[PDB]
Amino acid sequence: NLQNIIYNPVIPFVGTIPDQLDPGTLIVIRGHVPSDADRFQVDLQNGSSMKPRADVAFHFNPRFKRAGCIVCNTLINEKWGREEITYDTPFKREKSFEIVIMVLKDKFQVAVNGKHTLLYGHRIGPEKIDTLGIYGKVNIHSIGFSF
Numbered sequence: 358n359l360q361n362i363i364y365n366p367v368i369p370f371v372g373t374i375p376d377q378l379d380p381g382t383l384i385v386i387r388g389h390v391p392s393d394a395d396r397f398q399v400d401l402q403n404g405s406s407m408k409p410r411a412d413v414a415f416h417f418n419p420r421f422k423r424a425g426c427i428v429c430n431t432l433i434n435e436k437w438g439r440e441e442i443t444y445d446t447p448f449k450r451e452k453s454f455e456i457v458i459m460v461l462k463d464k465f466q467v468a469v470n471g472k473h474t475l476l477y478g479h480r481i482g483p484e485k486i487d488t489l490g491i492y493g494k495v496n497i498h499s500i501g502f503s504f
């Protein structure tokens with residue numbers, strides 16, 4: 358079932374993932390976007406090194422300026438790849454949310470508040486993911502895993 362690794366963590370949060378993200382694994386993140394929020398990110402990482410900066414297999418980046426959007430990308434050897442921008446974003450300032458990330462064989466599937474939001478094909482073997490980090494202006498109520 359779901360095994361939360363932490364509640365109301367101080368942001369930025371960087372934690373180690375208890376088990377390998379094998380296809381079928383779910384990542385559940387419940388939080389809230391503060392009214393003065395410009396953006397925030399959830400990064401599935403390979404290690405928690407800050408320098409050199411640890412690779413980010415999956416960069417889930419909601420942005421709030423203008424109409425808003427969600428930028429997804431991958432950071433390999435401290436270099437960002439091709440961005441995959443999703444314009445149909447459900448995130449809003451002053452609103453709560455539950456993010457469910459499904460780890461499939463060839464990609465991540467993300468749904469927010471029960472509604473499908475986006476897909477992102479693996480650019481790095483998901484098996485190299487052992488750390489989860491949450492940065493930016495966002496309040497997190499919980500982070501859990503379903504292996």
Ligand SMILES: CC(=O)N[C@@H]1[C@@H](O)[C@H](O[C@@H]2O[C@H](CO)[C@H](O)[C@H](O[C@]3(C(=O)O)C[C@H](O)[C@@H](NC(C)=O)[C@H]([C@H](O)[C@H](O)CO)O3)[C@H]2O)[C@@H](CO)O[C@H]1O
Binds near residue numbers: 428437492
């Ligand atoms: C072409 C275009 O649309 N403009 C891009 C612009 O999107 C891009 O912004 C960066 O986008 C990546 C994802 O592709 C990340 O979202 C970057 O966010 C972070 C990061 O994690 O790297 C957030 C982090 O907090 C920032 N660190 C600091 C010091 O505050 C870093 C940092 O500012 C940048 O890495 C410096 O380059 O960004 C987000 O900045 C930019 C930069 O790649 O390039 C335009 O062309």
Ligand SMILES: [Cl-]
Binds near residue numbers: 461462463
């Ligand atoms: Cl797949």
